[PDB]
Structure 1
Amino acid sequence: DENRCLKANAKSCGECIQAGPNCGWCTNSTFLQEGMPTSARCDDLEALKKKGCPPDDIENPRGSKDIKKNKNVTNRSKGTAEKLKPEDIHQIQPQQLVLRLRSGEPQTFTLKFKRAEDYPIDLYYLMDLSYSMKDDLENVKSLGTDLMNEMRRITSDFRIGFGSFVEKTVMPYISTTPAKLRNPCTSEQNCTTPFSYKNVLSLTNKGEVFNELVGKQRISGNLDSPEGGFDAIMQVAVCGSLIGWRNVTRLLVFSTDAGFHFAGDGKLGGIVLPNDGQCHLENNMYTMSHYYDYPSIAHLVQKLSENNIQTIFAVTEEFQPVYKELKNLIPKSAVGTLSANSSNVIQLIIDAYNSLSSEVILENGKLSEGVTISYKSYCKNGVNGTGENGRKCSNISIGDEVQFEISITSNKCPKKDSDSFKIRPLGFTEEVEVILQYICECECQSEGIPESPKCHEGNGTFECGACRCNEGRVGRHCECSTDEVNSEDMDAYCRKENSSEICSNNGECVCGQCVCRKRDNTNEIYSGKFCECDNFNCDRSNGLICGGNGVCKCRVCECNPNYTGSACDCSLDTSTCEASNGQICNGRGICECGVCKCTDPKFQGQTCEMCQTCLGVCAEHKECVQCRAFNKGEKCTQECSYFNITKVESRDKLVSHCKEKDVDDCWFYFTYSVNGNNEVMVHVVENPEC
């Protein structure tokens, strides 16, 4: 009966459920002895049945999962009603769900996700304005018109926006000398003053307008090889409204031919202030660059993820490797090959977008201590993902449904109030909120009225039929009140026999009951009414208490399902008893404690394999011709399992053959064939001789 609930010594019903879900608390506790405490009330559901009495009053609540709404996503995108508006169509089926958490019970739900066939795309193009990328600018002017046409096939709603990020103005990054300031390049060449962050234009439905703005843009340059693209990218995401971000998937195109400075690179610059991730742009110009130091890569990931802006990197083969390492850090982003003059920029964007769309990942909200989440996913072509692979599926085409079972476990009842949290994948405005209302109350406790006069005018909580004595009260009635001013005649209830020590000399006696004295080596308080039982007074099988695996109960070793005996180390395993022949303990004997006890006379050995005195097999095993066939005598096929061979006049004269007399007094020739170790082959001559 050893379990956490019993070990917990549950004071009230609420503790039986908290200690173990299987354990149930009987309010009636009729079976429970008055002397026995509240712990004895709590018992396993299977264990309660062991008693043979079932209590209706006992409460065993089980956690359940419910759903507030069950909306249906449009299927096949057919008809005017389907995809009527962005808010109107929801990819996620269940908007939110409600479940009940029970300690020791897992809770899993099914989430149905299907890709929407039609979804608008917004494309913000961040292009390095460095002198090396000049050639790229001329192509980017005629690119916008080509882009719009290609993206129209991909999506019936495409918006093009141009962004120009160079580097933060500082004495070290860019030449302080005023002559260079006017133009970063040589005097003969024409280069515009460097600007760390500038907006050429916002997102528009017409690509032609974009073309005109690109042409006005003038080539710029920076002294350092790495450019401050990171600062420009961060500003775009945080502002949002400025870039005119919409629910339509946003491709964060980022094209540069050089490296990127990150985190506290301002140090040489002398700026010790980190980026605040806030919008300070004025007239499409960010002038807080010499105020805030370049933001860290982790900080940039937090912003892009928060605004769900897909990040696509279009960099040259020289810096390709560096950007690939960064890719793992920033999610919902891709890396493609960039031409010297951005000739294949349009081809990259198209390919990059397809890869990002196929990969879908689920992210949940911050969870309090004692709360965990498990992900189980379903994929096409028989591919199953677990752990990290379980959370995100891949190779998802338009109109393809993928489901993700999520398991949430809540224990310790930390918060009584309901916890509401929201879970959503990157690039998807639609989210899923799982709300949980923890129940830690007791139905009987609600029914139970405080200060009940039955239990000595409420001295002990009398909820339902269960009476739990309060501090200073021991028993069913708790009419003791411990020590009093007028000394009483000890406690008659404490000792069955007055002559014997109060509570069998095992503890302190009060309120007409017995609380056993604490023991450091074993469970402090012993079991029993008179505390006469003990948890460390049992026998040891071999230097280990109760076989080393048994549980001591009232100074009595109880063995496990695999053990039997006072020692309790005696296993029920008969594997050691078995021999090569295949009969337990050879021919005869009883397998007890893993050591065969030979029964048949003059049988010695571990499996009693040595019986020299024992009569010869041919003589003793004469039942093979008289039990299988010509049935007569005793019994049967348990011992003589050897196969009979139909051999006539076999030349095997001495293995050693044997001869006997039959019913008609006819000689019978037979033998048992053994060549190596133990072998079994019977050769009884069919042809009879009289």
Structure 2
Amino acid sequence: QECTKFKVSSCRECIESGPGCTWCQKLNFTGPGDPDSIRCDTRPQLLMRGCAADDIMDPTSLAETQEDHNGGQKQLSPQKVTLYLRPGQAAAFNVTFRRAKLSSRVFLDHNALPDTLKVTYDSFCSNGVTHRNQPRGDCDGVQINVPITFQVKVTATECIQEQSFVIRALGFTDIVTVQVLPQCECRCRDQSRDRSLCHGKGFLECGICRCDTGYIGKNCECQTQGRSSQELEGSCRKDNNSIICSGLGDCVCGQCLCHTSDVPGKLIYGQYCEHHHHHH
């Protein structure tokens, strides 16, 4: 899987970036030099970088199905389907058609949808014929008391608003009620059980500390006083066209904290972490 991203600053922005994108809510996951957007990546990349399973945010597209007491509907099942849709990721569910008297050929279709929703049908007919990824369900040679199966795939191009639509077999009063819901929000751990999180001077939002006014840093550890945020950054960059701590460190309250390496011999040092040694 692949994840294309650009300067993502929230869990939702990461999920909206593509079905292959996952978000790491792990505290202090972004080491010195690493921006918040590093938290957004493919799952095996985050796992490699030490993000645990309980810290990887990755909601998926899924289908929930329900049958009524079944005195209500004979030929189409299930009667109720709930879809949670993540943008770009298809949700699949099967609709069973059971012939009573009816028709030799059966078509499965849905009412008009917004352009943000894409629906295709696979047709697993009883006569051996199999259609895949069609705009409609289509099965000829349908016989009484031998069920046929249609696989419905629904894909949203965005975080859609909650809506419903129906799936019907042409020539029949039967209705499959389909409720669709967005799957774009992340269920992250909050601040409730620790007042020391973000030094108690900021809001914890999916691994990111949104520091209170007068506080900066990845953990809101630096109180700025009247010293401006840029003033403390100036002691961390060599010139005005350069990047803070040579992109290899964090500016911790006016001073660069350099990235430490596990690679033997590697040492990142200097006022701006500008010395990259291979033989230390």
**TM-score, length basis structure 1:** 0.31
Shift of 1:454: 5.6
Shift of 1:427: 1.9
Given the superposition, is the C-alpha separation of residues 393 and 68 from structure 1 closer, same or farther in structure 2, using an over 3 Å criterion? same
RMSD: 3.6
SS of equivalent to 2:75: coil
CA distance in structure 1 between the aligned counterparts of 2:25 and 2:135, rounded to whole angstroms? 48
Which residues in structure 2 correspond to 1:59-78 (within 5 Å)? 59-69=57-67
> Which residue number in structure 1 is paired with residue 8 of structure 2?
10
Is residue 69–residue 96 contact of structure 1 (8 Å, CA) maintained in 2?
yes
User: Structure 1 residue 438 and structure 2 residue 174: aligned?
Assistant: no
> Which residue number in structure 2 is paired with residue 466 of structure 1?
208
Given the superposition, is the C-alpha separation of residues 420 and 104 from structure 1 closer, same or farther in structure 2, using an over 3 Å criterion? same
User: Structure 1 residue 374 and structure 2 residue 120: aligned?
Assistant: yes
Which residues in structure 2 correspond to 1:209-248 (within 5 Å)? none
> Which structure carries more relative contact order (alpha carbon 8 Å, separation 6+)?
2
How many residue pairs were aligned?
244
User: Structure 1 residue 491 and structure 2 residue 234: aligned?
Assistant: yes
- Equivalent in 94, 105, 114 of residue 78 of structure 2: 94
Is residue 38–residue 468 contact of structure 1 (8 Å, CA) maintained in 2?
no
User: Which is helix-richer, 1 or 2?
Assistant: 1
Which residues in structure 2 correspond to 1:149-168 (within 5 Å)? none
CA distance in structure 2 between the aligned counterparts of 1:399 and 1:63, rounded to whole angstroms? 32
SS of equivalent to 2:184: coil
> Which residue number in structure 2 is paired with residue 24 of structure 1?
22
Given the superposition, is the C-alpha separation of residues 473 and 363 from structure 1 closer, same or farther in structure 2, using an over 3 Å criterion? farther
Is residue 96–residue 149 contact of structure 2 (8 Å, CA) maintained in 1?
yes
- Give ranges in structure 1 of 5+ residues lacking alignment: 73-86, 120-356, 508-512, 517-526, 531-690
Is residue 373–residue 407 contact of structure 1 (8 Å, CA) maintained in 2?
yes
> Which residue number in structure 2 is paired with residue 501 of structure 1?
239
- Give ranges in structure 2 of 5+ residues lacking alignment: 251-280
CA distance in structure 2 between the aligned counterparts of 1:382 and 1:489, rounded to whole angstroms? 72
CA distance in structure 1 between the aligned counterparts of 2:203 and 2:68, rounded to whole angstroms? 45
Given the superposition, is the C-alpha separation of residues 35 and 528 from structure 1 closer, same or farther in structure 2, using an over 3 Å criterion? closer
- Give aligned-pair identity as a percent: 34
Shift of 1:480: 4.5
SS of equivalent to 1:116: coil
CA distance in structure 1 between the aligned counterparts of 2:210 and 2:217, rounded to whole angstroms? 8
Given the superposition, is the C-alpha separation of residues 385 and 471 from structure 1 closer, same or farther in structure 2, using an over 3 Å criterion? farther
Given the superposition, is the C-alpha separation of residues 483 and 413 from structure 1 closer, same or farther in structure 2, using an over 3 Å criterion? farther
- Equivalent in 41, 44, 52 of residue 42 of structure 2: 44
CA distance in structure 1 between the aligned counterparts of 2:135 and 2:114, rounded to whole angstroms? 24
Shift of 1:440: 2.6
SS of equivalent to 1:443: coil
- Equivalent in 155, 173, 181 of residue 429 of structure 1: 173
Q: For residues 589-647 of structure 1, what are the alpha-carbon distances to aligned partners after superposition, in whole Å with 9 as ceiling and x for unaligned?
A: xxxxxxxxxxxxxxxxxxxxxxxxxxxxxxxxxxxxxxxxxxxxxxxxxxxxxxxxxxx
Is residue 121–residue 153 contact of structure 2 (8 Å, CA) maintained in 1?
yes
User: Structure 1 residue 365 and structure 2 residue 141: aligned?
Assistant: no
Shift of 1:448: 4.3
Is residue 112–residue 402 contact of structure 1 (8 Å, CA) maintained in 2?
yes
Shift of 1:53: 5.3
Given the superposition, is the C-alpha separation of residues 9 and 481 from structure 1 closer, same or farther in structure 2, using an over 3 Å criterion? farther
Shift of 1:116: 0.9
Given the superposition, is the C-alpha separation of residues 63 and 483 from structure 1 closer, same or farther in structure 2, using an over 3 Å criterion? same
User: Which is strand-richer, 1 or 2?
Assistant: 2
Shift of 1:38: 0.9
CA distance in structure 2 between the aligned counterparts of 1:398 and 1:405, rounded to whole angstroms? 20
Is residue 11–residue 23 contact of structure 2 (8 Å, CA) maintained in 1?
yes
Given the superposition, is the C-alpha separation of residues 420 and 19 from structure 1 closer, same or farther in structure 2, using an over 3 Å criterion? same
Which residues in structure 2 correspond to 1:234-273 (within 5 Å)? none
